[PDB]
Amino acid sequence: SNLTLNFGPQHPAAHGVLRLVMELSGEMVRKCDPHIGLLHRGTEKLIEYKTYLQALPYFDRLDYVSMMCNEQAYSLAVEKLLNIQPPPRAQWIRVLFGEITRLLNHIMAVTTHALDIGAMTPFFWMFEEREKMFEFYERVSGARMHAAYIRPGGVHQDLPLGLLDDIYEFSKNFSFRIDELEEMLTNNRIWRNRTVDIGVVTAEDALNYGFSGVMLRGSGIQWDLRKTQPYDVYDQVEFDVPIGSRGDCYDRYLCRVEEMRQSLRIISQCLNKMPPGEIKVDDAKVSPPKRAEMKTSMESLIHHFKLYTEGYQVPPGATYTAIEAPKGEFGVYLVSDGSSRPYRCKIKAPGFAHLAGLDKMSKGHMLADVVAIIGTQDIVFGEVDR
Amino acid sequence: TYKFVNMREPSMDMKSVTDRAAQTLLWTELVRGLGMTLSYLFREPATINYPFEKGPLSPRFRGEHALRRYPSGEERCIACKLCEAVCPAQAITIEAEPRADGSRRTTRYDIDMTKCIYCGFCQEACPVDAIVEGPNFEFSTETHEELLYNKEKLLNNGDKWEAEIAANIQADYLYR
Amino acid sequence: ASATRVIQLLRNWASGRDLQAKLQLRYQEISKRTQPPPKLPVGPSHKLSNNYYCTRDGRREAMPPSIVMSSQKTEKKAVTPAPPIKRWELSKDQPYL
């Protein structure tokens, strides 16, 4: 009989509130059975009970590591259902802050994974950069991580007069921090022994199991939603897609580092190409009017009243919209029935499929190998449990 | 367009083979990692001396809620109940009646700080700049009951933080 | 920063780079905490004359989905949902990392 052990919820490497029941022979892993739902808060029913604007805050919370990307995915879905279009400046701001969010998520994913592997120092070095990016978030929105900045009509407010310069100052120096991380991790033989040929998944199995994002790209599959199905302005920027060759943890780590570098490239392009204009769609029946017009114009006051009390109606219909969030393909299936409240809102998070495939991923490995495989999947349980 | 990340092979000339053997037997990359850590040791740490120093904030920062007044002393709130209708957490509870002088004013304005998500939608929805999210964030309490604000507590917050709230609004109202 | 020059040389040799060029700490190159007021342009539909709302109503141009092959109701070449995706090119910037 195999020994049965509980990994998590109150464990350092459980990554939050994950209960994993594992059958071990010795330290060999015979079967992993993830038990989730310890962070299931019934987000979708609550969304059913709110208006389209009131449900926006919930989206940041699904994945609390890359909050801005989640709002953008939701915003795109609502805009597609509304048959409207955000202004160019709003789209460029969206893509810039999406790249910043990707940087945040990758730093968190790489450092925590290293911390689980036992390399403590890299996490401390990069969380100062994460703090600076939180400063950017707070300056643009007023909240460090739960901005709710990206709205289903554009963005909420224009950038402060001295934000692009500070973003440039941070971006011109982030490369050396990435280089120090790579110096400490990439060529280390202990790191390679810990990550090479651990959690190898084949391309066909990765496709069938529903994997997306790096978990696809690490197996050699050339797929990226910003290149094949671009959404905001991603067809106007140039970047490269890192492709792995072995499908193990090491290849995915290298892919994430290269993704950080490419997102720095995209941030430079966004900084150089930011256009002038308005920040939300110039349609007062969808986006609220300016505070100056709400206090002088009768139509503006009526529209502000009806937008903040009832909310805008969305024509009936169903859509599935997916973006390339830092953790993979993040999608929403939104069903509207002509009301001001969504009828149904199903959230697709790549962590669901990745954690489902963890059991196949940890065949013939040790306990520490299972810790590494949990680290390499980039799992956050807010989006897994919803 | 794409690039490979782990698709390079090492040269097998005797010089490179001997260099790799020296790396294996003498731990060159481990010494490089030790050197990187040592270099970080001699830098100035990024730690601030809290509470004597504070992290930077912005005029748009959302903190503790407050209810404001007009320069004459009259309350700005008129009990339109827009903030209550827009609150995603249903944290605002409002009851109103005509005042003794006939004004449209609240008799109850309750905010549950433990239900609130500090999203700032309430100050967006308000048409008279009555309810705001102030700059304060150091208001931890020892009991749950102390985080259930009534109208008197919010008005006291406004009276206490108005000098800075007005300046913060003056620095950002042109972006709204 | 303010480190002693010998300590600076020690850091540069230990890390292998020139840390004085790029410092993680921000000293004086950030923007001022007080900025001039902005002006924030209006938008495309702020005209007074050629701006009837029924000509810019996105919500009212949405119509129910097209129904093809309702069950209740020759060459015929086979078709795909879309033309096959094209092969990606190998990054003239930096093909191999």
């Binding site: 692009l164 011109k172 490369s175 790579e182 900084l271 002038p276 | 020296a22 | 001039p36 007021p37 002006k39």
Partner: peptide
């Protein structure tokens, strides 16, 4: 009647941003 003031990049452009890996050799034979 004042001009429009907004957060924009400076005229011309921003300076180049380095992103490629920089790992020196720094060793003997």
């Amino acid at each position: 009647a004042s001009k429009v003031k907004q957060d924009m990049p400076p005229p011309g452009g921003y300076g180049p941003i380095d992103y490629k890996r920089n790992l020196p050799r720094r060793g003997l034979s």
